[PDB]
Design a protein around this motif. Sequence first.
Motif, mmCIF file in Angstrom:
data_model
loop_
_atom_site.group_PDB
_atom_site.id
_atom_site.type_symbol
_atom_site.label_atom_id
_atom_site.label_comp_id
_atom_site.label_asym_id
_atom_site.label_seq_id
_atom_site.Cartn_x
_atom_site.Cartn_y
_atom_site.Cartn_z
ATOM 1 N N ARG C 395 0.911 0.364 -2.621
ATOM 2 C CA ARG C 395 -0.224 0.759 -2.056
ATOM 3 C C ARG C 395 -0.024 2.241 -2.467
ATOM 4 O O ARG C 395 -1.211 3.045 -2.774
ATOM 5 N N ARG C 399 -3.289 4.550 -5.925
ATOM 6 C CA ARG C 399 -3.392 5.337 -6.265
ATOM 7 C C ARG C 399 -3.692 6.368 -6.681
ATOM 8 O O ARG C 399 -4.624 7.518 -7.288
ATOM 9 N N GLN C 406 -5.972 -0.057 -11.123
ATOM 10 C CA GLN C 406 -5.938 0.900 -9.242
ATOM 11 C C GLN C 406 -6.473 -0.154 -8.550
ATOM 12 O O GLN C 406 -5.345 -0.543 -7.594
ATOM 13 N N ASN C 436 0.245 -5.361 13.034
ATOM 14 C CA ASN C 436 0.566 -3.450 13.121
ATOM 15 C C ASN C 436 1.216 -2.078 13.237
ATOM 16 O O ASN C 436 1.258 -1.649 12.595
ATOM 17 N N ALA C 440 2.785 -0.084 10.599
ATOM 18 C CA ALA C 440 3.035 1.611 11.101
ATOM 19 C C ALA C 440 4.411 2.096 11.349
ATOM 20 O O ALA C 440 4.412 2.460 10.181
ATOM 21 N N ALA C 443 5.691 2.700 7.153
ATOM 22 C CA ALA C 443 5.197 3.442 6.772
ATOM 23 C C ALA C 443 5.682 4.588 6.934
ATOM 24 O O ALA C 443 5.770 5.676 5.990
ATOM 25 N N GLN C 444 5.331 5.053 8.213
ATOM 26 C CA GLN C 444 5.853 6.282 8.945
ATOM 27 C C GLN C 444 7.169 6.463 9.369
ATOM 28 O O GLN C 444 7.968 7.386 9.055
ATOM 29 N N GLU E 386 -7.905 6.428 4.738
ATOM 30 C CA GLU E 386 -6.795 5.497 4.482
ATOM 31 C C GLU E 386 -4.900 5.846 5.498
ATOM 32 O O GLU E 386 -4.904 5.454 6.327
ATOM 33 N N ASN E 387 -4.629 7.381 5.059
ATOM 34 C CA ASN E 387 -3.693 7.625 6.041
ATOM 35 C C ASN E 387 -3.089 7.947 6.655
ATOM 36 O O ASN E 387 -2.715 7.372 7.641
ATOM 37 N N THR E 390 -3.283 4.574 9.045
ATOM 38 C CA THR E 390 -1.488 4.341 8.499
ATOM 39 C C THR E 390 -0.596 5.267 9.121
ATOM 40 O O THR E 390 0.003 4.968 9.673
ATOM 41 N N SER E 391 -1.708 6.506 9.704
ATOM 42 C CA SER E 391 -0.856 7.225 10.627
ATOM 43 C C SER E 391 -1.323 7.336 12.456
ATOM 44 O O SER E 391 -0.260 7.578 13.463
ATOM 45 N N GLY E 393 -1.537 3.826 14.581
ATOM 46 C CA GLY E 393 -1.052 3.602 15.391
ATOM 47 C C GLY E 393 -1.319 1.545 15.663
ATOM 48 O O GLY E 393 -0.826 0.970 15.835
ATOM 49 N N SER E 394 -2.012 1.780 16.662
ATOM 50 C CA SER E 394 -2.952 1.380 17.960
ATOM 51 C C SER E 394 -3.590 -0.204 16.630
ATOM 52 O O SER E 394 -3.259 0.335 15.344
ATOM 53 N N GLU E 396 -6.108 -0.874 15.488
ATOM 54 C CA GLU E 396 -7.451 -0.924 15.452
ATOM 55 C C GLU E 396 -7.165 -0.292 13.867
ATOM 56 O O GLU E 396 -7.829 0.733 12.629
ATOM 57 N N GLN E 397 -5.864 -0.673 12.815
ATOM 58 C CA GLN E 397 -5.107 -0.123 11.623
ATOM 59 C C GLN E 397 -6.091 -0.430 11.107
ATOM 60 O O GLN E 397 -6.908 0.240 10.151
ATOM 61 N N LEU E 398 -6.714 -1.842 11.009
ATOM 62 C CA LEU E 398 -7.830 -2.763 9.493
ATOM 63 C C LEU E 398 -8.969 -2.104 9.962
ATOM 64 O O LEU E 398 -9.294 -2.593 8.612
ATOM 65 N N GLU E 402 -10.801 -1.003 6.842
ATOM 66 C CA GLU E 402 -11.636 -1.020 5.668
ATOM 67 C C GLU E 402 -12.834 -0.178 5.830
ATOM 68 O O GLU E 402 -13.923 -0.727 5.303
ATOM 69 N N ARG E 405 -12.241 2.320 2.468
ATOM 70 C CA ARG E 405 -12.418 1.099 1.783
ATOM 71 C C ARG E 405 -14.150 1.235 1.432
ATOM 72 O O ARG E 405 -14.660 1.136 0.382
ATOM 73 N N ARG E 430 -10.967 8.412 -7.342
ATOM 74 C CA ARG E 430 -10.345 8.341 -5.939
ATOM 75 C C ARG E 430 -8.873 8.609 -6.731
ATOM 76 O O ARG E 430 -8.266 9.749 -6.007
ATOM 77 N N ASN E 434 -6.821 11.507 -4.957
ATOM 78 C CA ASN E 434 -5.559 11.907 -5.114
ATOM 79 C C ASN E 434 -4.421 12.745 -4.695
ATOM 80 O O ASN E 434 -3.502 13.276 -3.506
#
Lengths: 270, 155, 499, 483, 490
Positions: C395, C399, C406, C436, C440, C443-444, E386-387, E390-391, E393-394, E396-398, E402, E405, E430, E434
């Motif tokens: 991923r 990008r 891509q 989830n 997380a 990745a982190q 997106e980042n 990903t940072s 945590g809870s 509600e990531q997806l 989305e 996206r 994109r 980046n």
Amino acid sequence: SGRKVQSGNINAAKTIADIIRTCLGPKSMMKMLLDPMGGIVMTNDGNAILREIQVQHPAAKSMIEISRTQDEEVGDGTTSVIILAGEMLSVAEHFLEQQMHPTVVISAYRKALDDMISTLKKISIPVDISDSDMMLNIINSSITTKAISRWSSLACNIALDAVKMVQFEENGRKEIDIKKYARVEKIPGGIIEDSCVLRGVMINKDVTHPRMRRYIKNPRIVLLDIQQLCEDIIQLKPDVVITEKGISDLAQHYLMRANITAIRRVRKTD
Amino acid sequence: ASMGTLAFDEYGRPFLIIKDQDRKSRLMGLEALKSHIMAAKAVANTMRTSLGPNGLDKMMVDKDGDVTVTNDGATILSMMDVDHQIAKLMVELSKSQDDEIGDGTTGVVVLAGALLEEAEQLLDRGIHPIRIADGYEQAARVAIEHLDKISDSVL
Amino acid sequence: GTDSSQGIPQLVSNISACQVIAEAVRTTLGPRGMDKLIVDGRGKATISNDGATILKLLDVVHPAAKTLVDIAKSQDAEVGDGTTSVTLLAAEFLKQVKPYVEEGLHPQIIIRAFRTATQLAVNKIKEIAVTVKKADKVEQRKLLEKCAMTALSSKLISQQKAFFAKMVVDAVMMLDDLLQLKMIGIKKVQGGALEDSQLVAGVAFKKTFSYAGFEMQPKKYHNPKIALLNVELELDYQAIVDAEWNILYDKLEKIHHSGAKVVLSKLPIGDVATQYFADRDMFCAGRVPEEDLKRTMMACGGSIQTSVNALSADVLGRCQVFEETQIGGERYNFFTGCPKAKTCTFILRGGAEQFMEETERSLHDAIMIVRRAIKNDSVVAGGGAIEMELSKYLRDYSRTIPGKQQLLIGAYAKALEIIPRQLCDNAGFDATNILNKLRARHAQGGTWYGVDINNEDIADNFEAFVWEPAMVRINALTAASEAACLIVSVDETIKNPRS
Amino acid sequence: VYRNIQACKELAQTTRTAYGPNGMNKMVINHLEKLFVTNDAATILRELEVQHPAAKMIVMASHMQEQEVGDGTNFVLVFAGALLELAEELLRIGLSVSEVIEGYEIACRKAHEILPNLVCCSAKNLRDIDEVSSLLRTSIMSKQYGNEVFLAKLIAQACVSIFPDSGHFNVDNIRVCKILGSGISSSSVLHGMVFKKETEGDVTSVKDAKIAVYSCPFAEELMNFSKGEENLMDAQVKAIADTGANVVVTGGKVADMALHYANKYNIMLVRLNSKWDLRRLCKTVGATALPRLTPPVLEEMGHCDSVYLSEVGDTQVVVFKHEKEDGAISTIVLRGSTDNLMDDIERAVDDGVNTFKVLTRDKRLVPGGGATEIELAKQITSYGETCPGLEQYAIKKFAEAFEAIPRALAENSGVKANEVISKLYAVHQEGNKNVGLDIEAEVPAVKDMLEAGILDTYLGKYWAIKLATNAAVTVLRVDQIIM
Amino acid sequence: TGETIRSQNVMAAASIANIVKSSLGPVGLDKMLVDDIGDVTITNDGATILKLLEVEHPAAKVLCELADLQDKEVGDGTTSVVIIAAELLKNADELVKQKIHPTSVISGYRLACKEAVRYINENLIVNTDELGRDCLINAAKTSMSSKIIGINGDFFANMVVDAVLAIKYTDIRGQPRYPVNSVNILKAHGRSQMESMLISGYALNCVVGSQGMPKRIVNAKIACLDFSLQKTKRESDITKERIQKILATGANVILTTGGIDDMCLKYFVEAGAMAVRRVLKRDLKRIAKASGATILSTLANFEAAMLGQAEEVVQERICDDELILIKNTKARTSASIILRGANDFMCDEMERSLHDALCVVKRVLESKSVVPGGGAVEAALSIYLENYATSMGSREQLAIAEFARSLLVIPNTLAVNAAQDSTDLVAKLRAFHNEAQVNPERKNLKWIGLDLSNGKPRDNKQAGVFEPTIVKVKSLKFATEAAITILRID
Ligand SMILES: Nc1ncnc2c1ncn2[C@@H]1O[C@H](COP(=O)(O)OP(=O)(O)O)[C@@H](O)[C@H]1O
Ligand SMILES: Nc1ncnc2c1ncn2[C@@H]1O[C@H](COP(=O)(O)OP(=O)(O)O)[C@@H](O)[C@H]1O
Ligand SMILES: Nc1ncnc2c1ncn2[C@@H]1O[C@H](COP(=O)(O)OP(=O)(O)O)[C@@H](O)[C@H]1O
Ligand SMILES: Nc1ncnc2c1ncn2[C@@H]1O[C@H](COP(=O)(O)OP(=O)(O)O)[C@@H](O)[C@H]1O
Ligand SMILES: Nc1ncnc2c1ncn2[C@@H]1O[C@H](COP(=O)(O)OP(=O)(O)O)[C@@H](O)[C@H]1O
């Protein structure tokens, strides 16, 4: 959706384009129209057949309206436009199918038309103005091949005066012209050669009682729509005033006191 | 619910994926387990009434028409018209029990039916079958040691 | 009455068939994975938690499904059991490229991008693979014993499980010749405590009504070897009956002269004539199983006789000793005591009659897990940790690529995520929160956190000793990518029936 | 006539997408219902049992094309289909079949006499194995994908360069032996013909060995029958071992008694022989079949010079070398996961062999990759308006049919065909003949491949153009038949 | 029959989007709209499309009124908000279909909307200051692109931006204001379009009222009047008393909309006035507000100070045309643009281009906070969110993923409508963005968007493709609110 909608539009376009593709030229075929009651009419004109025919597709209706509105703009050529549009869409068939966007097609068509204008302006042989010989040659080229073959002289002289009695030097040099300010009088009676041209408008209406003066050496016609206005006209005393109100005998003598000759029951067309 | 997903396409053009799903049936997870345990209700609550001294007998007839009245649960369930695979599995459960014990055919079927029913209203609370299986194994060992508590022997 | 075989419609049909094939065997992945009884239509229901066996017994007619199944079988025969993983991964590739081929993405672009992403992943995995072979594996085997622990973690058999792991690990050191599936087998014993299971350098086969002749064999015999005979030995009147008696007499004389301690005949040996046939003065048997034979020619070389009075040097050849003792009250028949007894059998000693399936799922995995740990050196944290790491790499690199590749590489990375998803599905936990947290944290926080089957929470599976061969994962991913490329590369199907 | 045109157009469209290196694979189900994946046009068409007689004509014309050129059948299908589909609208305009026939003939003659004006030929000779191997990459890229061409070209060319005697080259001696196993990189080259046997009683250093090919390969009364069978088997083996027979080949099985008898005369028991071997052995070492085991006679007996087992590829296989020509036969050893991708590899090898043979018949080469096609199209369509008469429309349509092929290659590559063909045609006026399409770039960019060395043959292209034009002309002539 | 009603609502929303999807962008295609009586309707923008669209399904209707209320706020981007909402709906419906409960979807969407709207404020542009010259010119030329008039186009851009900045108001709020009707087109004859220069003020081509005008008078009080000075037969003949009184009040340049007087030449040279005919009412009001005066219904009954003034009047013949240079009034509102050529008809393209340049420059002058165009903002938010997810945590990531996206659907539509390959252009955007955050060195690369004129990646901060911050912020907020409202329905 997708290509199918454009394909439907342009197919409906091609159908009404080639329904009358034979109807132009000096040897036009005559088309066959029947309404669903047995009535029969034989037609040789593209405008008439396109008017009487009934179609439902929006593209066909739009192009029929385009032809109809172009009819009054220029007159001749009302079918060549439809034929050209239909053929251009029929050849665009092959480019719509090979998956190219319509935008490049529009750009190419606009470039082609830009070249069209210049090329037409190039090859066109010059022609002078009001010279009798090639003017009559033009008359034979366009006016003839119709029901005025044995009476072309009257059309020739009427056109020759008409092109000179509607001159408008408004913003340039006579380049402005109109086709609706000519006081045409189509009155049946007598031989067809009785037609003539008279400088100035003339009106089918006049005073009911001709016990009064109408002709003056300096007619100062004034347009107008209670005697207050009648004796307020005396501000300059024009000899003749044109209005749209009835005049009584006492009102007529009031007009004489006002040095005016009003008219009644005259439409805006006059 | 019925006919699965009703779209017939993703945009609108003619398209088809599943062959005649209208008269077919699709089950995924919980619905399949409900079907199996409902079969378990059928077999168990049919079997239950032949239990104990007041256990009545049964009349069961195959497609052939054999007249049969019995009282040993394995015999009742032996030739009955078994249609669902887990019901058949219970049938050879009883057959094996009769083969290697010969008594207590009524007990195994009723016990299994009760376990499966209580498991289904457990699932109705949203619990995954692995936990129920582990708890039932723990119950099994508890029951086994309880039996071993008060065992007795004969001549 | 719907016909759809055009290029894009055929591609979507093929990959939808692959999706259905995956959906069939979605839930069997993992050690705590559930199963289904499938009846072959002959009344024989089949239960086997291994996905490869499920596909082997499964039959599907779609050519795309057939190709996917063939690729799965090819993967199965090479290394480990990754058939479920590779099938799920390929099907995920297909189902996430659905929304890309559905609007005009040409297949060749997808093939090229998939090849590029596969190379990227197979190169980025080598920077994370860690070798443990030198970390006290051949000697001071605590780490390998913990690897054996991981195959049977979180169970009350732990007291027996430690001894069983030491059992299998010692069997590995004394059979460290790249052990396979067939080189080691198990046999079932009814009754006895679970702890009583013990390893014998041979095989176990209980004698039945048509297996052996008589009891009290000379167990402590210096050189007993298996002798196989293709001649009947069991028991107009003066023409065939006297011929039968003569045949019996000469066969008995042949048995006496041969002196073979163990004699096998092709016809069954009935036990009703035990008193009649107790006069042979040495052990005689019959109806030898093919598995028992295959476990004895390589043990010390049992011979086969093919004449009326056939005698060979290996009817009484050199094998150490014979074992025949009462196992559970019934005397078994052990073909032990062999110089090349390269077959160690775990005696299934337990009080549960239906414990065979649990033994197969609990004893066959330990030998395989230790064998794969020994064979390869570089390992990565399992339980979806490596899959999450590869997904993050792909991923974050997608990008960075300018071009149509891509979105394809992004979809590839998104499709590498099903392994933790499927594992937590088969565990029964809700997939959303566990995936989830895992994503997380991976990745982190850390690069090796994986799924936990015991406490059902995110944990660093590297510390949990969740190992897996790096090369096995590499080739499994390569095979899945190749399968996806081949199935995408389809345009038209041609059948042209002869009829 | 339009139905025939529709049938040919559909047939061409079926195999159009397989053109070039970027051909889609095909799911091939044969008559016996077997899975098969491939991209070669000849394989699917030879499996396609089409029904329309016009399709029959076009396919048999393609077959004749493959007969003496060995490749380009996909090209002739695409070309003839384009020609016919344009002739469809030309007929729809109101023209006559005859006049378009003469127009097509004139265009074909013009193309034939302008083709030799693109001279990018072989460097010096069939020698310099590496150089010609780099030359032979064309058909290799064509059938097999460009990933494996680097090794496929070397394997295919090293084998054909073994016997360059007197400038005469043949194809039948070139064979490929099926050896499953490790990856493609492990495939190599060998001299002779390779097949496997069963027994291990093999002798390597053998002088002229006489090959014995079999047309038909492999209580008192009980003892009497056993002894009679023993005597019969001994008589059969001694009949086999007559006249000092040293090597015997058979497609049957082995037996302990049979191998004991074979080693009694110290003769290897070549068994599990391939079904294809019975007559290829006869044609390669002058052998013949035996009705049974008793009549091996010296007159009807084979003759091979070297018969030794080779352990190459970690497999036991016997190879025959140092034959009468001493280098004629030259096999190719393969290695792959399964036969499915093996088939495409060996077909690419055959295509390379055929292209090399065409090079033997013609050291003259022409640029490929859409270069020569658009060049000929430009020349013909420029000559078209200079020719008065009604053949001019047929001439432009023949040029458009030439234009079709690079468009097909482009759309197979996955790029927009219209953009790349426009760019390529525009550049070809000043960016002359050597320019052409670029495969790797996703953007429709052009690239000169004189340096790339991807250059298709001359004589093959000439014959392909001629035969496709003749096929289109012939199918255009027929009007109708009740069906 | 019927199942998963949310799927049907999402399909209806997707259909509504697909009706309008291809029409987005200046190069978007037109649509045919047919009613029961068969009326014709051709348009590009989707606001009027949804105004005249006959929607039937309730869920689709909800999107219709959300787009309508979007229109009433900023009047732009309704197509974008509808497309964004439909993409969010389909993505969230998919997420539900892989069994993520919609409450987490809604929470993640709200959080992502807040994060993105906060990110906009920290990555916008305020370059539309006095120092922004080349960006304004090239933005005006992009608005004027695809025209042959671009040979002298740079001079036109310079003069038009100078005129619009000089004519800028100063309202009570303090924000810059510009009257659109103040400036107008004016044809010319003789020299071609390459010599069309700037006109400092409003000029009317009429009869020369007073040629003896000083080049720069000390005071030119503009007195626009409607009553004509014509002799008849507080005065019986309104010729002298009215003009004498208005001159005595203080007015210098007295303008009469009607005809001239016979002897007005003598009066208008001694009083510094002139009678200019054919004064357009739309321009009469503009010049009255420029001077500061108002139209007089009648002079009878103010004029000493109410009538506006100017500090110079020029009476000269320019490009074969004499113009009434009533310029540099009290308030800078009087302005006009000369169009050099032959007539108005063939210069329609250049006057239209001047009008569009005026509109875009007036849009970018106000709302000083501005954002890059061409899809740069969408790519920037897609990189951020997106980042950030990903940072986060809870659970509600997806949802946020989305959301990120779905924010890249507008660039795809723009690329499709520009005939370029959508995937390649969006991937290039994109990838370019980046390194705009991954590498701090490429900090100026954030302003990379589509070049609709050709379909290439290019900086648009320099190119001047600009949108107001408020418009996009409210667009995103409205789209998120619509998505939440629809997803909360089942
Ligand atoms: N006698 C003729 N000879 C050759 N061409 C003619 C003749 N009469 C008309 N045409 C051509 O036919 C075209 C169409 O003109 P016509 O059919 O008269 O009216 P319309 O364009 O309205 O159908 C004209 O462009 C003209 O060149
Ligand atoms: N006289 C009795 N009093 C109490 N319980 C009884 C009596 N007889 C039988 N039962 C109970 O009935 C149960 C089942 O018996 P039954 O159904 O007749 O045969 P089976 O044991 O084969 O199922 C036993 O578990 C036993 O406890
Ligand atoms: N104790 C455990 N905890 C978590 N995951 C495990 C454990 N044991 C095995 N796994 C997972 O199981 C997977 C291997 O399953 P696999 O052998 O592919 O199943 P199958 O044999 O059905 O294909 C590995 O990826 C590993 O992550
Ligand atoms: N690397 C390449 N780049 C462009 N074109 C190629 C390349 N390799 C082969 N080709 C083209 O492919 C064509 C032949 O391919 P194909 O039709 O698949 O098989 P055949 O050789 O039987 O016609 C040749 O005309 C050649 O120009
Ligand atoms: N020249 C251009 N290049 C790229 N994008 C543009 C250009 N002009 C306008 N746009 C984009 O079009 C969008 C507005 O289009 P649209 O929603 O159709 O307008 P409306 O809402 O008035 O119908 C803006 O967000 C802007 O980014």
